[PDB]
Amino acid sequence: MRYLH
Amino acid sequence: TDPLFSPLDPAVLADPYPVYRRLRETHPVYWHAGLDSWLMTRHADCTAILRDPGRFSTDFRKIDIPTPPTLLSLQTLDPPDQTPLRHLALDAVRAQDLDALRKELTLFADQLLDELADRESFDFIHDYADVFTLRAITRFIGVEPPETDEAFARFNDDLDHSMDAQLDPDAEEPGLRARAHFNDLVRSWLGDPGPHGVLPDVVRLLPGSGVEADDVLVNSVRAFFHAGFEVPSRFLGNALAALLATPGAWEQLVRGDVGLDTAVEELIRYVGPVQALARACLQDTELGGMAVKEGQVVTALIGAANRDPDQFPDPETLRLDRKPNNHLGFGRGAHSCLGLNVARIEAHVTLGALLRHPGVRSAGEPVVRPNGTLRGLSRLPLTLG
Ligand code: HEM
């Protein structure tokens, strides 16, 4: 879970 | 399978908040073997991670993790390496005219919802939210929208899925591929900019910012655009769904017993889309009575922390008049959201326009997207009124 766009 | 938290489990994806609550009650700082990370479920500890870059880094290269192509960017560096890009973007963003944006959006929402009122029923996610937020983000940045064929939704799905790659290793390469595709779109934009908007300002503001015009700035612009598109659509679908599923809540907004000001904030706290923000521990630290070692990853579960009863009385209830409401929906610190003002205009404009159709009601079962990091729906069947 890495909030990366 | 994890004894306490399986974020891609369908039963958890249907409703993660009871799992969050139980996890926070039993192991507020919990070692998750599968995600290979500590999970923080408490508002005080998430804020502490988010505020301390020297001790919790987004640059996972600092714990010997190579950053894949397309991913070294504004989001994946810390000060001072990040501060030039952060300042270039902050300047480019503050140079914009938000009233012009708000007004053009209000015309657009009102027209879109009179169109959808003509139908028997429609899907709020694909027929309103996605159309609306894509208009919002391309107008704000100053570019011509991409074409929304099935290949676009396919790259979007891969990129979203790629955020959960630690739990599904086959998701990584399609996310890089998808992010490269949108970099090819960003390069086009930067290589022939239009006259106004955030992206023209970046090109104009480069000389002497300290930022080179390379793939790092390109990856940064892609992430600005993709977050600007998807995250508000995730929010709009969660918000309207919660209002209709919560008895009395829409009636409260329709009657005007509460303002959009406290209501929109409470909607962000309750069902904000961002669920996790990960960081790399650069120095041994104690959190929640647990020794977090240098080299380990920690994850702020801000969706869980926004329902922390230590911070919010009656945290599991949608109280549209909540005050104060110190939610973490938009993050904190060096990496806090650059679009929060655009986010809130979209939410006030969308909600203001729906309140023109007081008889709005569900027309089917919502469907939850199979994502854990960034939570939203893939359909919300509705009929207007
Ligand atoms: C309701 C909608 C939105 C929510 C809930 C939201 C939430 C967040 C959160 C929690 C972060 C922190 C990430 C971290 O700490 O690593 C963030 C960062 C960011 N947001 Fe938003 N966001 C929204 C909409 C937008 C929009 C509309 C834009 C652009 C127009 C945008 C651009 C960004 C960027 C570029 C960052 C990265 C900042 C950095 O790494 O320094 N977001 N957002």
Author numbering:
A (entry chain B): 1 to 5
B (entry chain A): 10 to 394
The authors write:
RufO is a unique cytochrome P450 enzyme (CYP) involved in the biosynthesis of rufomycin, an antituberculosis cyclic peptide featuring an unusual nitrated tyrosine. RufO catalyzes tyrosyl nitration on a ribosomally synthesized pentapeptide encoded by an 18-bp gene. The newly identified pentapeptide substrate, MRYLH, is encoded by an 18-bp gene located upstream of the rufNO operon. RufO adopts a protein fold typical of CYPs, but it exhibits significant differences in the surface regions that are critical for substrate recognition and catalytic selectivity.
